[model samples]
Target chain A: SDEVVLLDFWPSPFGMRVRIALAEKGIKYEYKEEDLRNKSPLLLQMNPVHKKIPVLIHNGKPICESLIAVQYIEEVWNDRNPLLPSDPYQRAQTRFWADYVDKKIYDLGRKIWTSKGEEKEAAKKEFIEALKLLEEQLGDKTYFGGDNLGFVDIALVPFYTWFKAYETFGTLNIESECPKFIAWAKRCLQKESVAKSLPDQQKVYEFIMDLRKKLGIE
Target chain B: MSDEVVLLDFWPSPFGMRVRIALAEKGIKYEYKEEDLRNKSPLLLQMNPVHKKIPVLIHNGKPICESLIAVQYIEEVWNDRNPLLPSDPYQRAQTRFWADYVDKKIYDLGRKIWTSKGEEKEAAKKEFIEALKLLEEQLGDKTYFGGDNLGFVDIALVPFYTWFKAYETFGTLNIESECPKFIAWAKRCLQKESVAKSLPDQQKVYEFIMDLRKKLGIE
Candidate 1:
């Protein structure tokens, strides 16, 4: 039996990627939640480099970074479900967008909810605009990988969980801005892997509200 | 017959060395064109218009920007010999993660070492060593990061071997004492023809940096 353990935080979209990936592969593992305020000693030891979750420990060896962990899950449990595209060019494209999401979307979302005045306004506009590019990438395809919830889908859908939170705090309408993208998110939520892995939208929104108050942004 | 491959690069750049090592490992024949960062070349401008940066791999007329991406492309294209990534998915992902750490953590902080002054420079040196120490811990007893042969992470970090001289002079840290294992790994990498040929002489790099400092109005 493989000793697979995931060190995660509930509200982290990054950690959520690993959870969704594990579900997609039907891999059973122990999930240990961490308090980000005072991180666990094991987490500190396992991931001394980043010291951030989600860290996936497989057979006593630890892998840090969510996208990297998801790739590891896909590789190890490749028999059941294939997440990434097989073709090299297609793999490159998927990696590019997933990297883009990490680089742009997360920071943009943070700025929208956390900052104020001109910064928040700028982040809101940039967030929508960047998402529209992703929308164009999604197009009429059933999923980002077309007809399946593959790599890009697993990479992105977790952030979609935060859409409601973004709307509540940032005072923006995601549906009006990217209708097709929202529809895709709804379709993704229909999947058991995604639905079970994601925290409830209302719960996430409440968390965001509490976070905003804590940060003195409210 | 495939179109001639060309690498738009600058000499003495760690990022560019990564692409060079990968190509050399694959035993592929490619033209290596040096870039003038100050003036900028038209091909570089057209190929990597987004960053307009060096280490752009031009294959069959299509351009691949970013060093790691280019290395991955080379691996896929010439994967028959000298596999850069492992067959196992977990290992592959782990390799990618560490290579990414090298890309993200090393160079950005290295820029601070070379450019900044006063408290900022001191902070940069401290942070850079911290990253290097973590890397040393990872190195442990392995000859290379991937063990025995040079791989993705090795290629990514060995390029920094050339920069160590510059880093010591500008940042004021003794790397051999701090990370002996990493320094030994670099020495092992230099034994390979690919790494040796790809990297310029250390003295050449040092002189280049001195000229660069003068141009930047730094002492």
Candidate 2:
């Protein structure tokens, strides 16, 4: 009855977020794989507005929005595992970084990785600058929430797998340019929950390279 | 401190609903002022220089942009008879997520639909339906988004109910059939004493929308 069914599209970093959080919590559920190009009625019935994937249906009720689904999953399956920190202020700061990464990194990175010439270059510059700021913000902390992984860690972990692709296509190195972040990502990936579930880095790189080609980005 | 709390709001706007709803629930009163977007008041411009949108709540002269931010600010200040969010942090996040979802999905869709016409209008309509479908999924069978009593999410979307009725009357829209739970939630909020008293009457809001639309020659 408490099973959380996630409507997801594989290859989506966003969808994988819900999967990772569920895995981290040791929560089990059914996965309804969606074909986005030709969406299922269930997907439309569940999420009409964006009709996007990563919708989690818990106990037969669908929770929309990837981050929201994660938060909802955390609350519904509480005591099994915790995603957020105890202190309110600390929690707010975690949310700040999670939101920061989504807006500044994910949004901009997609644009940068998919465009060509001047526009792509400008976005790449901003992406690098943002990564530098993120590196500085990270400092020596093992995770953004420090030592232990929580909401912030769960929220950001998806990007690491895709970073290799971005690096290869953009000809910019994350491990070399931002060593500490690279180390941190590796540390986080050590968790069996994250490691077993993450997609192949080569596949991600190839997929992104294909995407870039389609966009005429070379 | 009985220092004056200032509200930066545009007249006939439902986005201001959250701030008003929270205040009403808390039984806290504040100074209300209407802002003109065409000729934005200096106070409105000053408070939200970044987005330059309302409703902004300035408590002791500190500004909060976005309605939910203002609602949270009010919740922090006026922890009185009613609390807007859940006690648990995770529950609070769930509540916050739903509120933010409504803001982006529902509120944004309404804006796009209102400001567009023809092919754009058709696209907006599709987008709007899609957003509502997601809402249906999100709501599922919950009595209220808060699970029982009307919380932030309920307050956030209640204003749209009033607008839906307006759009139903004028624009070609059908919310009741597609999103029955959402409609039910809106009705439930209207029944609440606090919401009933504070929110502007439907007729007045509709009249304002009509006058604005006529001015713009929207048909």
Candidate 3:
């Protein structure tokens, strides 16, 4: 019997990424929710280096890092569905954009929720600039994956769930700044996999608000 | 038709060094242009309009930015030669994770070591050692990170081996003294012609970083 397991925290954009990928691939797996406070021994054992969640454990072997886990899911479950493109150049492009999402999105989002005054302004500016870059890249395309929700889409769309929290904390409007991106995200939400995998935006916003209190930010 | 593979690079960049080592491993013939980081070439600007960073691998006039991405691109295109990634998906994920860890942890920490001072510097040194120690755990008793073959994680990290001299000089720390096994692994990787030739001598790297420090008004 083959066992696939994911150690996850619901509101984590990174963990949400793996959830969406698994949902898309139609893979059966066990989901273990991690309490970020007092992380499970299994999480520590599986990801001793980072001691973080979104660990994909397959038959006792653990995969750390969300994109890596998603790619692993794509590779292992390659028989039915395809996430990455077949051509080398296309594959490189998809990987590049997914990596771009990996690099850009999360840190800036956190900075918005956590910082204040001038520091908050700089964070918001950079965050919007990063999104604008993604906007131009996505320009008029149906999906970043083009008609299908592929690797880059999976990488990025999960972050949409956290946008509500970012906007509420940072005091900014995203739709006016990036309407196309919003539309693209809405389009992604149309997919059952994306719809179910991502936590509700308001719920994510509530989580962040609670976290801010815990972090002594408020 | 030979695919036009042009590498726009700067000599001192560890990221650039990754591309050079990968190319050397594959024995792919290509044009290497050493870019002036200050006055970047128009080609570099147009090629990688986003980051404007070096180690841009221009394949048939198309530019691929980001060191690891370009390295993976090289691996895919030149799959006939030395396989940079293992065939198994799980092993590939393991290789990619540590490499990503290096990307996330090492570069910024190394900068903190050389650029900052006092508590910050000490903290950076402590963290850097911890990071190296963590790396040593994965590298336990292996011939290379890929185990008997140099692979993606090795290419991703081995460039930092060249910079440890500069890091030691600026940060006032001894990496080898702490990370003996790590240093031993570096020596083994350096024994390969691809790595040895691609990486500048430690003394030269130290001199370059010293010049850089002077330029940046570091005391």
Candidate 4:
């Protein structure tokens, strides 16, 4: 069987998600690095509408969208690593939490990374509230979907690399405020795939610091 | 079951794509009525005013809006035949989660890509990028968001199927490199006959997008 190839960009959390999934599943593939600023024609032809990165090409067909790609990966390679639960209802519940994290955590997390002053503060408050909601939903459970690390956990853990940067950027401490979440993040990072994939927190912080400088934010 | 189903749809809409696909999958023929946004059919207006978007399904004249909701309704109504949602609850939730994710993020974010300059444009772009990034993460290890085959959630996110040109023209953003997995997912989903039949041609959508950009004054 022809191996699936992944087109991606490094330093992207989205791409990181794909990489982690592949590693955990032990799927071997070719990886193509893309310059997001100047996209290639291959990418354009493959994904004409939303010509974005992290396109997974399997048997010459493109699987576009990160979550969609992940789902496709799981479906096609079910035996490699079981990312989803065996129970359909439990899987749906896990998916709900995963979707919640996707919609709320990652969707709105930018305000913390991009804003300044009162606006930044407001965004941080909103993000924190959202995280708290996620935590409360977790409510002493080890993982969002229960003890087992299933779909939602895999979907979420990649972004923890940016938390320190977020802390400095927003002047907030997630570990201090949400200790359970801190424990959860650490637990998630403990996995070999998760731990190996995460770049040093300092590197992410430096990257953000440079980005903020370029944006003319003091 | 009973071969009785009604879909409240607006023509030339991708949000309605899922309902079309669902009906086709079940081989269920439905009464398809078009809604005019400007002069909405009383039936459409009555079904939903909160969102006021099309792709509403009325089963026995009971209304449901949002493509995912309609898809869910279809699943429940015709559970015996080709099921859109999986029998398991977690699987069903995953379908709903992805469907809802597609609905809110792709719809809203893609809208920003085509929206013109202003605070709204900036906000939309930022929000859209964020959604794309998160979606990228969510897709990390799956084949179809539906797992084995196309599901209700996969159906829900089909509306942003043809807005790349619109995003490029207005926001000067290229989605191919920015979010590639999502791109591949869209391509794969569209390959199925059920999904393919419902997907509008990209060029037509591009042309419509031109008018849309002008109407919205997004340069």
Per-residue lDDT of B99-215 in model 3, one digit per residue for the tens?
998998788899888889899999999999999998888999999998888889899999988889878988999998899999999999999999998898888887888888888
Worst 10 residues of 2 chain A by lDDT: A86-95
- Candidate 3 lDDT by residue in tens digits, A15-63: 8889889888887889999998989989999999889989999999999
Which structure among the candidates has the greatest TM-score?
3
**DockQ, computed on Cα atoms, for candidate 2:** 0.16
What DockQ does predicted model 4 obtain? 0.03
Question: What is each candidate's DockQ, to 2 decimals?
Answer: 0.49, 0.16, 0.83, 0.03
The sequence of per-residue lDDT tens digits that candidate 4 reaches over residues B161-208 is 666666666776777788888889888887888888777777788888
C-alpha root-mean-square deviation, each candidate: 2.9, 5.8, 1.3, 10.3
Candidate 2 residues A108-132, lDDT tens each?
A: 6687577667777787788877777
> lDDT for each of the candidates?
0.87, 0.74, 0.89, 0.71
Residue pairs with backbone atoms closer than 3 Å in model 3 (clashes)? none
Error of 4 at B195 (Å): 16
TM, chain A, every candidate: 0.97, 0.92, 0.97, 0.89
What's the chain B TM-score of candidate 3? 0.97
Q: How well is each residue in B55-118 modelled by candidate 1, as lDDT tens digits? A: 9988877788778878888898787879998887778877898899898878888878887898
Candidate 2 vs candidate 3: the DockQ winner is 3
lDDT of 1 at A158: 91
Candidate 2 docking class: incorrect
* Model 4, CA-based lDDT: 0.71
